C-alpha cells in the first residue's frame, strides 16, 4: 500500500468493506518491522518469513475476493493492484495452473537457485515422503530459506 498523492485515483465504492481486513495485515507488518534483536540467525530468518507469509496472506485474500469468492468489482481490484496492497505477479502465478497455492515468486526462479531448479517446497509432500521411504530417512526439511514454506502445496 503506497502513499496517497494528488495522482492517486481514490478507492472506488466497495473498498469500505475490506479496509479493516487489510488494515490488520498492515498493522501486523508494522509489528513485524522493528529491531526484534534476534541474536540467533534462524530465528531472525523466521521474522522475515513472518513478513513474507503475511504478504502472501494479504495478496491471497485479495485474490480470493476477486476470483474464488467473486465478490469485489474489477475496478476496485485494479486500484488495489496499482496501490500494491496485493502483489500482481504472485496473483498471476496463482491464476496459472499448478501454482494454485504458491508461497511466493522467489521459490520458482530457477536462475537464483544454485541447482537450476525450483524451491524444494514446490515438491509435493507426498513425493518427498516417498523419497524418504525409499532412502530410509524422514522429511529432512521443514521450511525453505526464501520464505516460511512447509511445503508449497501444489496439492
Amino acid at each position: 500500500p503506497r502513499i496517497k498523492t494528488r495522482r492517486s485515483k481514490p478507492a472506488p465504492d466497495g473498498f469500505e468493506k475490506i479496509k479493516p481486513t487489510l488494515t490488520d495485515f498492515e498493522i501486523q507488518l508494522r509489528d513485524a518491522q522493528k529491531d526484534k534483536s534476534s541474536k540467533l540467525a534462524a530465528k531472525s530468518n523466521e521474522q522475515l518469513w513472518e513478513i513474507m507469509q503475511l504478504h502472501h496472506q494479504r495478496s491471497r485474500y485479495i485474490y480470493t475476493l476477486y476470483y474464488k469468492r467473486k465478490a469485489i468489482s474489477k475496478d476496485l481490484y485494479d486500484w488495489l493492484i496499482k496501490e500494491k496492497y496485493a502483489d500482481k505477479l504472485l496473483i498471476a502465478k496463482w491464476r496459472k495452473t499448478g501454482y494454485e497455492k504458491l508461497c511466493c515468486l522467489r521459490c520458482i526462479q530457477k536462475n537464483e537457485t544454485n541447482n537450476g531448479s525450483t524451491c524444494i517446497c514446490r515438491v509435493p509432500r507426498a513425493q518427498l515422503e516417498e523419497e524418504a521411504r525409499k532412502k530410509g530417512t524422514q522429511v529432512s526439511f521443514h521450511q525453505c530459506v526464501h520464505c516460511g514454506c512447509r511445503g508449497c502445496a501444489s496439492t
Binding site: 507469509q53 496472506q57 512447509r150 511445503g151
Partner: peptide
C-alpha cells in the same frame, strides 16, 4: 494415488495455507 487421500491429508497440517506444521 486417490485425490481424496490428499484431501484428508492436507487438513492434517496443523497450520493453514502455505505454512503447514506436519507435526
Amino acid at each position: 494415488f486417490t485425490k481424496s487421500e490428499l484431501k484428508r491429508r492436507r487438513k492434517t497440517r496443523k497450520g493453514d495455507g502455505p505454512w503447514g506444521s506436519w507435526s
